[model samples]
Target: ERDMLQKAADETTLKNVLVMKQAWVPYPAYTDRAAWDSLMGSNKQRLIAAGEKLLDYKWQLIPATAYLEYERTGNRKIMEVPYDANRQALNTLMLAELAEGKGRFIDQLLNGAYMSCEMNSWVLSAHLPRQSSKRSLPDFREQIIDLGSGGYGALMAWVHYFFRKPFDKINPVVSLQMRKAIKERILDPYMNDDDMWWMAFNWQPGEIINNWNPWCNSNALQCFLLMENNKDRLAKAVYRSMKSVDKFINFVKSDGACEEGTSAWGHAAGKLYDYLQILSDGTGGKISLLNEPMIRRMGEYMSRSYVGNGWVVNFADASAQGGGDPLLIYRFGKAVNSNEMMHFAAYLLNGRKPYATMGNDAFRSLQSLLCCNDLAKETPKHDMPDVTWYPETEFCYMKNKNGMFVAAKGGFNNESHNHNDVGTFSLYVNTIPVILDAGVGTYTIWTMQSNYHNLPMINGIPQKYGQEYKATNTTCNEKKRVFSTDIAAAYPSEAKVKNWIRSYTLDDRKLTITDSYTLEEAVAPNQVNFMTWGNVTFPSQGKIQIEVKGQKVELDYPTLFKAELETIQLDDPRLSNVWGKEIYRITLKTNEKKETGNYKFVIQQI
Candidate 1:
């Protein structure tokens, strides 16, 4: 793929074309009362209401002990919860002040920004090890731009951009200090450093560049475009970010599937769109890649990955239930001229509040305020294609006429945020999850293991982790609604697997999974596991029933296997929030050990 941004830079004069200062009007500034007043009454009220709740918000302190908790106990939430709360409160107050223009929330917002600047580092404890010092604590001497710091910088930059005058009226030092902090914390390091792994500047073979690239770059681009005053420096910073962002784009497969999974598409391809859009706007439309085929496909990946209702193809570490930010999706769709994506966005937005919440980023919130009404007017397309395939990523989503959706993957185990699920498959009947990926739990060592996923334990050995442990000879026949792969290599030699062909055939009312394998020796009974967010019961031998949301799916297996149910209690809030209190794991253990055998499982709506 061409370096689209570099191409744009070579062809266009960056400093001349880049919109700067007050001239860059992507949204209504505080001075534009009429534009603010023109917003939907309900939306503005919602923003105000959210802000009103935070008027007396006590900004939590991220204690040093809390920062050390991750290294000590691997508890990220200890520090992150408070850190995120302070920012969310500030963002809500900022948006609230913008909507009301009554100056009620300005003081609180200023305090949040000031507190943010006073903090030793914006980087999270989990990510602090990325700094040159390789310690959990922030090395103020080395400013490394990670996702948290970049986001913090962007937030501070937006605060500086919109409320500079208001803050100046209160105290000139407010905006001045913010600009200085942003430069030192995000801009300067971003422009000077080349070692940040997410930048992909020194990318080595097989080193995966995932969401952090575009996610951080998008924030850095926002800071440069919004806060950088020197024209030459501004252009250089923007172009540098462009080059870095291009690496992420180059890393993406042409098929535009997010190997990180559907939940991450918002940060992966979704953030890439944010970067491209910001670049285009900063360059006054001169650096547009919206029309590029790759860009279009990237934007459409969200729609392509959709299953039904709020469910998406949750592979890898992606959540099982996320349709992404509707406003952002709608905007990306519009930029890429993808009506399907636009409609999909509208469908996601339907019955949902389109206004920004406490959790949204400042730029996206502002963008939402500008375009969400238009997005709400778009007619939604509720129907997805019967078959969608990403050949490069080796992910396939197929829907049967009876409202059954099946998604399967044939990618390597070393994918970003990887789960050792090289040939795992998920089944959904009437948009209710039956046999499903366990999505992910709170960040921990246990969640990444293959035993936690929906793959077989060959000879009591789970799939190994690495690029070499992967599916091979992957083939997808969209017309036939079949996906096949040889997943023997995914297992280590201890499993003694010679060849294991896993094939999924989606029929009109059923999904049939066939596993044919040749094993050097079978030391233990092979157990094929299926995780589900449903009530499972065995009516008889080789027969299982899963009931979800009043819809039932029956699974039929060979009589040679016995079914055992393991109830996995979800204590992690991240996993429990999605799958409720517990998720069930149905394991089918082979009755007799064999060197070579074939088995099939058929899932149908019951």
Candidate 2:
């Protein structure tokens, strides 16, 4: 009976995930924005040329699909890869509105992109038994598996829209072939797994299974939704792999708390969950955040993570700009019915909607409603946990008489998705988060550049570590999973932060958290860790106490650590100093002396 029921539920979920009865918003070929009608105003010609780059990428390069990103951002640097003649056709044409030198410059850039794409097209045509020096090339094919067929779909879509005709004069066939590729190569091979996907070339078949990368998940989900709306239009493959998403939903911890840890990209972190919710909504099945526990805690974590610069500490996997994907925020707020998440959406939207250049109609459509221009909102009062927070800006600390919690983060200013928020910590107070890990990030390549000065308020620069020409030799440390307490066994406190999911007591004194960090396979420490406390103002007086299973101890800072800031205020301290109130934080110097026992701390902020 259980087996049959499980099978039926699975079938139901799968069917809903692929159902197409619902109408996806029709693309606004012509819209309200008069600005969109012109070439310089997203000129169709430049747009098409921008798109041909997708074709160029298909034939050459490793095909990370970094080229497809050009659609979102018209960054010309991405257009440098190679394609074929259509790539050339795309080149010869410049925007209808550009002035003198700019027009020539635009044409030149297109020329280079076109030549590269054209060469690649020949390389693609080279597949056919060709005569030497024939110089002419045939249509591009045989690359479905290397990159996701989406690349083909992307370029074709670009050509169709830009030229008002099909790519290489091939319209219907492009969509059909691309669909066939998705089924045969990516989806069909993906069987039932508890997770989304491990990874894939086009739409990752493995995203539902692992870290649940949002960029990968969000992009693919939109593509899949479009595929379904067309009713398996190509009849190539259904979203057979999506059947596993329900199982992925179960991973939601009944609380919707992100599993990868808080430092995992914030709003973008659980993008799979957002799609899962939408999938459930249309398909008709029950997928709950168990009831919205984890996400709430995550909200609190994110709220505090930012030191007031409107950016997080870049703590772990999260970048300096908290996970800022406006689309993810828009959809997630709706799926979970979270006004707070909506606040996060508003935070990202501050003034922009989806990037006008991204050309992601589906995402933009959803963001429009989410933006809800006239929606009146109020800042929510997060159920801030009673956890006491401090910051040497180096480490965080948590403690009560009976026990304590210490968490330390170490790293430098650069990494793939890394930050050097070295020596930071989250301490606990009464099972409440007296101390806490801040939050994660949103955008990818764009926000990445935020590491550089003068980054656009919206876009990101590369990480400080990534800016280096050499991959290595940067100041970044592998982020440690946020450490927590057995403090939950101690006592309880109030949930002040938005996502204050859950809190437990530690012998009526300390508290342990299953809310943010999971210690199921929790390991023993191999090195020393740090923690900090904030909101201190005065001759800071506190005692640093440590208790661990088996460990050697060292106190790094002196008896009374002191600092002379330019000025210090009590009530309205440096709101900008999000690292917390400037004060003396007792430092603990310790070494792992054992593996199976517990490591704890007790600190008093008086």
Candidate 3:
């Protein structure tokens, strides 16, 4: 394995250029002096402004109950308040040092490090224990060895490692304490323990072992290589992480589809790439998955899902627009030898040095900087065909005539960050989402109550928010895209619906949806819902007209189904984050007062 890692690392130009470490030079590791000088040439003023702003920032006390409160309710602000300050301090310190070595900002960095070590919890609010009124919860000290806490340990290790000689000379005890904390908190536990949820050895078949596995492994590997001087221990740790990395890799769909959707791919598979590259570089290229087909396809998912102007098909809990840094993908492309992916990444970067803070990223900021280079000298042509399909994931796309683009998904209701959005599709007029997916709503304890899906008119119909659903035999071609699903599984047993099949078809200019239902017993009225980015109206000829921006699209329905319009209440914060506070949903109910019935609708360009 180490031999493979060595070979991969040696062959890759990205690692050669960016990861050629001379010694323990630490992060912001501009291996070449000119690289940093060149970076400062353009960003010196910006870095100074960024650092100055943080001088006025106050690092607040992080409450131990913040995590519990989120468990009790769904409040991210409590943790974000303290964590945001932590990031500001760390980011400022790094920028100051990069701009001018061992400057005044060094003290701020140490201060932040001390507070980070002292914090009761670095684990996200979402992962905390429940039973709010009960006092018998594990203390922060017990959970300090967790995946989330490993990130803080890595941050502290970097803080001490960055100016080891100078900082150790200036304040030996401070640096020593941080190192001891990292060892006691992260390294020792990881080396000898197997109790963490992210440890692959502890995972189960139906349980979630997602981003936490590789995300934490990346931070821990960085901490190990930087802090632990024992080569044997370092190798053991890497191999252990490699095993965990393999578990996460195997957890993903074989075709490399991220079930969590694009937004999370950054943390899931993307962080796995980070861990693999680190191991490859540290072990002389014996551990890299550079040419691995699964890894290569994982790198392609983001590029293939791009719908222009940053919007993507947010099939699951993913939001409408993708904000991941392109440099990571570009470097990943180079690592895996995917020219198309590399070019797409370069095009997204568009020949400009990416700004440091993309999507509030702090942990990967250094990696992002290392990836910034001359790779975008020639942006790759956007050369993919107008139509594309990913059948393994049951997804389809069409860049239609007249700058119109259509996307559809045929996936089961049971998925990571699952939404009951089987047989859902979206239409894009150029880059604007004319017909849209409702995407996601702000997360809360009740958010999973299955009611959130009911709010967005965007859902594919004869549907309610429940569990146990499947989409079978999904097929598509260049000219015709079809997504079909069985809704009976998605409904409750009380409904007694034997079969409910919905198929979505996209042709030259018209989009058609046909729904056929068979009931075990006579059922009440159930309407198919369509959520949109514009207002809706019903005309006399059994057609619904939708007004988007300045354009109009018509939805023609069977006369048998009663068409109605309802204003989708922007009650969820996540809804506002995407399509803003204003949107609408149109419903068509078939009076299926009978045992079996079929209904069809056509959405045509006007």
TM-score of 1: 0.88
In the range 1-606, model 2's lDDT, one tens digit per residue, is: 112213434444444444464443233332223433421332345444554444333333423243434444543243334443333333223222121112323333333333333322312222212323232222243221112222333333232233322222333444344445444333333322222232332333323333433333433444455444444441222243343333343333332333233346333344555444544544444433413544443343443343322434444454323344544554555555666565655564555533322333223332333333322242323222223232212223222343334333322333234432322344433233333343332223322232211111111112234222111111212132233222111111221111111222233333333222222222332121233233322233333333322221222223222322222222323222333442222222233322223323333322
The C-alpha stretches of model 3 lying farther than 4 A from their native spots are 1-35, 39-41, 55-76, 102-104, 114-143, 346-353, 358-363, 375-383, 443-467, 486-488, 492-500, 516-526, 590-597
Give the TM-score (vs. native) of candidate 2: 0.44
From the highest lDDT down, the ranking of the candidates is: 1, 3, 2
In candidate 1, what are the lDDT values of residues 107-178, reduced to their tens digit? 898889888878889998999988777888877687888888888889888888888888999999878888
Worst 10 residues of 1 by lDDT: 351-360
**Model 1 / residue 423 / CA error / Å:** 2.3
User: Which residue ranges in model 2 land beyond 4 Å of their true spot?
Assistant: 1-22, 26-208, 212-225, 228-239, 250-255, 259-263, 266-268, 277-323, 347-424, 427-606
Lowest summed lDDT across 10 adjacent residues in model 2 is found at 452-461
Which should have the higher TM-score, number 2 or number 3?
3
Residue pairs with clashing backbones, model 1 = none
Model 3: lowest-lDDT 10 consecutive positions: 452-461
After TM-score superposition, what is the CA distance of residue 480 in candidate 1 from its true location, in Å? 1.5
Candidate 1 Cα misplacement greater than 4 A, ranges:
53-82, 114-120, 128-142, 443-462, 494-498, 518-542, 560-577, 580-597
